[PDB]
From a paper:
To further study the molecular recognition of the pocket, we expanded the series of PBIP1-derived peptides to include non-amino acid N-terminal residues, focusing on, but not limited to, hydrophobic aromatic ring systems. In addition, the two double-ring aromatic systems 3 j,k were tested, both giving high ΔΔTm values indicative of hydrophobic pocket binding. The structures of these compounds suggest that they are able to insert their benzene rings into the pocket, reinforcing the suggestion of its selectivity for aromatic moieties. Peptides identified in the assay as pocket binders have in general shown higher affinity than those not utilizing the pocket, and all the most potent ligands (3 d, 3 f, 3 j, and 3 k, colored purple) also bind to the pocket exhibiting the highest ΔΔTm>4.0 K. None of the peptides designated as weak binders (in blue) showed pocket binding. To confirm the binding modes, we co-crystallized two representative examples with the PBD, the leucine-based peptide 2 a (ΔΔTm=0.3 K) and the most potent ligand 3 j (ΔΔTm=4.1 K). In contrast, 3 j bound in a way similar to 1 a, retaining the key hydrogen bond and the benzene ring of thiophene was inserted into the pocket, mimicking the phenylalanine of 1 a.
The PBD domain is responsible for the proper cellular localization of Plk1 through an array of phosphorylation-dependent protein–protein interactions mediated by the phosphopeptide-binding groove. Disrupting these interactions has shown potential as a strategy for anticancer therapy. The discovery of an auxiliary flexible pocket on the PBD surface, which is involved in binding a peptide derived from polo-box interacting protein 1 (PBIP1), has been recently reported. Our objective was to prepare more potent ligands of the PBD by improving binding to this auxiliary pocket by optimizing the hydrophobic interactions whilst retaining the key hydrogen bond.
Numbering used by the authors:
A (entry chain A): 373 to 594
B (entry chain E): 2 to 9
The structure:
Amino acid sequence: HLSDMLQQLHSVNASKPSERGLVRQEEAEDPACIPIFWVSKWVDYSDKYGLGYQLCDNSVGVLFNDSTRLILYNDGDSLQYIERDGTESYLTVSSHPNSLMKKITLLKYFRNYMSEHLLKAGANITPREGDELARLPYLRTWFRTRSAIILHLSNGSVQINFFQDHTKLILCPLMAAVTYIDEKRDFRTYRLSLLEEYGCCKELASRLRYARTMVDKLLSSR
Amino acid sequence: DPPLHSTA
């Protein structure tokens, strides 16, 4: 879907949504497209350990330097491990697996740190309804630019948090939608096809051009 | 102690 995201972001930009006679992005709204998952907290420690993240359901994930991942579930006991090829495994905290015991204790540092010291993003927003027992999405790859950090998940999502103005950009290619969060922390969910029809402001257009550039980077860092 | 993290 990373390639499908290019085709959606090409059409909206080729229509030039800020250069219109009258901008009406309120008419492009669609609240029923709100994502199920997004990254609420992150911790860079890739110089030693890896990047750790927290999803909106309080689940904590961590991506190690050798491209291996270990996720802890919402009950605080269930552990899912993904290997350096995309192979998944299931085990528990109390019933201690000795081979991963180092990574469990490292995960715990990330988990404690985020619950104690960090601020939750998109907090007030009510998430979308999903299958209760379905699998969690993990982190495929990430990179940092000057202006933003780019988070690419395993469910097709791409999230882009901007550093200076605290704004965030969630891209969902499956039902073709974008969820915006401004600096004053107000959330709006848009349909991209309707964002062509009716257009948007300058800051939404300049960040939808910038997102497209990050997608091209995500295809090139492989 | 991390060098970098999300909004604190």
